[PDB]
Design a protein around this ligand. Structure first.
Ligand SMILES: C[S@+](CC[C@H](N)C(=O)[O-])C[C@H]1O[C@@H](n2cnc3c(N)ncnc32)[C@H](O)[C@@H]1O
Ligand SMILES: [Zn+2]
Ligand SMILES: [Zn+2]
Ligand SMILES: [Zn+2]
Ligand SMILES: [Zn+2]
Length: 282
């Protein structure tokens, strides 16, 4: 398997080159557990969803904007901003003066759009401003590859989005037939507002840093469904935030359950939590 023709120092050095080619905060690779040089070299880091055949993209004709106070929306005037039309009073932006998701924010974040009259510095464009923390892909003890932040991250800090190939329910069926006995899957259902378009995000071939997030039964980050196209919601952003205070070099983990050979891989859980459920889905 793999590319057994380049040796350790070359394979690893090609991955570091692959990370340095990512725009934004630095992403690193370290391994002090064993001798594996890096994750797969056929993986591609993307800054935006990778659509496929059969997927109806988000139609911009259903997309609206706001007025607000040409520059930056005012955090203390949530009723004026048309982007917050949804949800029940008291209407408030999902973010506080510190740019972190409020503790009373729900599972749905409503951000501004390209239609809005903001200068991109709007406080309601957190996700769209991408990753802000420098991350590190490291090798774990009993799991495969993991991720950990290098700087302290308060509760509510945005980490990054979960990206990958957006595929249809049919497409996912024929990929399952390829997963071997010990295959590793990277799926994430996109089902929170509709169930007709049963789309899914697969990170096996294309994805973001978040592909390496490990499961934990007592996680420290959660998924907030961020929405820009307020019309069609068959596709939306999967935005990770901190639900606890996270210290440097602390492993980032979430719960693989916020709502065929896949469900017959599972494997055993090893998050070291006193409240561990004992099982896992790849
Ligand atoms: C989306 S993740 C991929 C991250 C994985 N660490 C890697 O090498 O890329 C799913 C896989 O990660 C491993 N994994 C993640 N969390 C685990 C956990 N608590 N316990 C055991 N294995 C875990 C499992 O092999 C699982 O199939
Ligand atoms: Zn705005
Ligand atoms: Zn606005
Ligand atoms: Zn807006
Ligand atoms: Zn566990």
């Amino acid at each position: 398997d793999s590319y057994t023709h380049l040796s350790f120092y070359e394979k690893r050095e090609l991955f570091r080159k692959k990370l340095r080619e990512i725009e934004g905060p630095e992403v690193t690779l370290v391994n002090e557990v064993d001798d594996e040089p890096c994750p797969s070299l056929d993986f591609q880091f993307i800054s935006q969803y990778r659509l496929t055949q059969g997927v109806i993209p988000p139609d911009p004709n259903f997309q609206s904007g706001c007025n607000c106070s040409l520059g930056g929306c005012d955090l203390n005037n949530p009723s004026r901003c048309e982007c917050l039309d949804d949800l029940d009073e008291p209407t408030h932006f999902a973010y506080d003066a510190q740019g972190r998701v409020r503790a009373d924010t729900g599972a749905v974040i409503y951000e501004c759009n390209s239609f809005c009259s903001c200068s991109m510095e709007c406080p309601n464009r957190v996700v769209q401003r991408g990753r802000t923390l420098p991350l590190e892909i490291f090798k774990t003890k009993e799991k495969g590859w993991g991720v950990r932040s290098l700087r302290f991250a308060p509760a509510g800090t945005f980490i990054t989005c979960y990206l990958g190939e957006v595929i249809t329910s049919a497409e996912a069926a024929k990929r399952d037939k390829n997963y071997d006995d010990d295959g590793i899957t990277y799926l994430f259902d996109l089902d929170m507002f509709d169930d007709a378009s049963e789309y899914t995000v697969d990170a096996q071939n294309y994805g973001d840093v978040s592909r390496f997030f490990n499961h934990s039964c007592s996680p420290n980050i959660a998924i907030y469904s961020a929405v820009r196209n307020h019309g069609f919601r068959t596709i939306y952003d999967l935005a990770f935030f901190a639900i606890k205070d996270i210290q440097p070099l602390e492993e980032l983990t979430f719960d693989y359950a916020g709502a065929n050979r896949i469900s017959k891989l599972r494997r055993q859980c090893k998050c070291g939590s006193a409240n561990c459920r004992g099982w896992l889905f790849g």
